[PDB]
Amino acid sequence: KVQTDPPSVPICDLYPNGVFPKGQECEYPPWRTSEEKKALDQASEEIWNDFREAAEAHRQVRKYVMSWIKPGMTMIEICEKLEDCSRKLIKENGLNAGLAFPTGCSLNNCAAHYTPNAGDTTVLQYDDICKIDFGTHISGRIIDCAFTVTFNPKYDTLLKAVKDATNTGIKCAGIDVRLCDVGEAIQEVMESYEVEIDGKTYQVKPIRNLNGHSIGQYRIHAGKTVPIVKGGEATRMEEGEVYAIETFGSTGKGVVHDDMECSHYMKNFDVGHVPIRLPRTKHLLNVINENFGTLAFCRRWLDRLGESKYLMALKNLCDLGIVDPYPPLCDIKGSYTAQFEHTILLRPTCKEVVSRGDDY
Numbered sequence: 001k002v003q004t005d006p007p008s009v010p011i012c013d014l015y016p017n018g019v020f021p022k023g024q025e026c027e028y029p030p031w032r033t034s035e036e037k038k039a040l041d042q043a044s045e046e047i048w049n050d051f052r053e054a055a056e057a058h059r060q061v062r063k064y065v066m067s068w069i070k071p072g073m074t075m076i077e078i079c080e081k082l083e084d085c086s087r088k089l090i091k092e093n094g095l096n097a098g099l100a101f102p103t104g105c106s107l108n109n110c111a112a113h114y115t116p117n118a119g120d121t122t123v124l125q126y127d128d129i130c131k132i133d134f135g136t137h138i139s140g141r142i143i144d145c146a147f148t149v150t151f152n153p154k155y156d157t158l159l160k161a162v163k164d165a166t167n168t169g170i171k172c173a174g175i176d177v178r179l180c181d182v183g184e185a186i187q188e189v190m191e192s193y194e195v196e197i198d199g200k201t202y203q204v205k206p207i208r209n210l211n212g213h214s215i216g217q218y219r220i221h222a223g224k225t226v227p228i229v230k231g232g233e234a235t236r237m238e239e240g241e242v243y244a245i246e247t248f249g250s251t252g253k254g255v256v257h258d259d260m261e262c263s264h265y266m267k268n269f270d271v272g273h274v275p276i277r278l279p280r281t282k283h284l285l286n287v288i289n290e291n292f293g294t295l296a297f298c299r300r301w302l303d304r305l306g307e308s309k310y311l312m313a314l315k316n317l318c319d320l321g322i323v324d325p326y327p328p329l330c331d332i333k334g335s336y337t338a339q340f341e342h343t344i345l346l347r348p349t350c351k352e353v354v355s356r357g358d359d360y
């Protein structure tokens, strides 16, 4: 009925009749706040409500994380503590409710897609800049939302720059808005910031090959990309679409490349059923189909299901194009990267920043 400290009560039990809190509602940028639109919006109320339940789990998990995340903890300890909480609040139930993708805790010049695999001894340090990026879902309605953790105030202005650029992207987004215009607007704001870190000055660079993305049911990246620099596609955002608006700022080259051991994997959404006779590969694909479907997973999540010595079977599925690997994405050695991300609903009546909290 009432949430505990530490959080343990599922969000569904905190609401009496399955009506979850709305996120931040915004008027679209320059007639909708329309009977045709109001009815069209109401027709998807069950869907918006699923996003809101997942968003409330995301808000409660991240507030709890911020209370205890500290240097000295291992990255595994952080991810396990966060994920244990997330499973409880979302009331994990197979593909009906659960974790939408692994917990990113990328450090320093690593901007995204790093989560420890078994045996990783990495310890969070006082000077680290850590991007906590995790997702929850109800019925495949995904919340993709992220923030940056630091302990040293030297990164405060870099975080402020990226947060403002993400908020600028969110404000610019709308029905019939050109994706390229969102990218231009984000870049102008991010580049308006100069920061000083350890006696060196930088003009914050958007990471040009990182992007926001449309979201589909059980589909983290549905096909449209939201650039964070100028020169993109004039393709428009459409009514009823859902987007992850994320921005990344860097003190390095402002470009990422694959680096480090891969931890994130996801079945290719478009690949059809593929009969497998190789026993270990067949078993692993069945495990993936049963537990994740088209949602992303990580090696730790296969380990927890009691799977072991599966790396060759996993490589086989990647080589067949059934599963895609998503390795960590890093800028140059010595650079600092920061990220903020929210999920927005392009509802017929308004734009809802469904994952907005009192934090960011």
Ligand SMILES: O=S(=O)(c1cccs1)N(Cc1ccc(F)cc1)Cc1ncn[nH]1
Residues within 6 Å of the ligand: 101, 102, 104, 112, 113, 133, 144, 211, 212, 213, 220, 221, 225, 244, 264, 265, 266, 296, 297, 326
């Ligand atoms: O970089 S992405 O592949 C992408 C961005 C634009 C078009 S495709 N990607 C989606 C994703 C892919 C695999 C995962 F296991 C989890 C997520 C961004 C992202 N990661 C975390 N939050 N957001």
Ligand SMILES: [Mn+2]
Residues within 6 Å of the ligand: 133, 134, 144, 145, 146, 244, 246, 341
């Ligand atoms: Mn994310």
Ligand SMILES: [Mn+2]
Residues within 6 Å of the ligand: 144, 212, 213, 244, 246, 341
């Ligand atoms: Mn994303």
